[PDB]
A paper describes a structure:
Cubic crystals belonging to space group I23 were grown under diverse precipitant conditions, such as NaCl, ethanol and polyethylene glycol 8000. Diffraction data were collected to 3.1 Å resolution. Thus, the structure of RsbS was determined by the single-wavelength anomalous dispersion (SAD) method using a crystal of selenomethionine-labeled RsbS. In addition, a β-strand at the N-terminus (β0) interacted with β1 in the manner of an antiparallel β-sheet. In a structural comparison using DALI, RsbS showed high structural similarity to mtSTAS and to Geobacillus stearothermophilus SpoIIAB (gsSpoIIAB), both of which are agonists of antisigma factors. mtSTAS and gsSpoIIAB superimposed onto RsbS with RMSD values of 1.6 and 1.9 Å for 112 Cα positions, respectively [Fig. 1(c)], indicating that RsbS has the conserved fold of the STAS domain. The RsbS crystal contains five monomers in the asymmetric unit. Interface 1 was associated with the formation of the asymmetric unit. A pentameric ring in the asymmetric unit was formed by tandem ‘head-to-tail’ interactions of five RsbS monomers [Fig. 2(b)]. A surface area of 663 Å2 was buried in the binding interface. Interface 2 mediated the interaction between two RsbS pentamers generated by crystallographic symmetry [Fig. 2(b)].
Residue numbers in the entry:
A (entry chain A): 4 to 119
B (entry chain B): 5 to 119
The structure:
Amino acid sequence: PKIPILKLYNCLLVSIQWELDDQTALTFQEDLLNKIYETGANGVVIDLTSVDMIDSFIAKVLGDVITMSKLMGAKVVLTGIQPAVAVTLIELGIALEEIETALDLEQGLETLKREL
Amino acid sequence: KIPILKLYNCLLVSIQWELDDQTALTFQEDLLNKIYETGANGVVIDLTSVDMIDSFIAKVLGDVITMSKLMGAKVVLTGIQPAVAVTLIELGIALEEIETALDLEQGLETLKREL
């Protein structure tokens, strides 16, 4: 079940809306970077509003895809992190300081535009 | 399930899968619910990645557009492929009422302009 990526002008929009799977997150990390490279988008906003909990594997995947996307030249934003997910990100801890984070998808896109 | 994004007062659904008849009704049921929950005035359905479609799914696509109008939301279809265009015409669903655009951004633009 590939997770979709939306291209809106110069931004990539992602919304995860189900329990993530180790095998799925790896495909998502693989797919997002290709989409950045194929489209040359300036910014990505990843929505985890519908993600109840995550594992350490996903946490590392999520942290790496933020770091990798920035290297390819795209500023990244996370939105909708729930308390359960926030705890696991802190506990590894993949709460990278350079994580620009937002409360909601709209706000993240707003923050994304003002950064650029 | 098919994910649906909410940007301000608009719904963006992109179908990057291969949709069977089972998924289409799930989509129809979920989209009409999403409008009612969100209070969205417009929705953009991107069919750019849909290689082909069948007559049954064609019909649900036409019903979704017309049903969402009744709820008060405007529907724009984007990225329809030639193969899909043949099937849509074949059923006769293709009406002047269907508002359509080439890609998601143009479809979203057409939406804001008419609201």
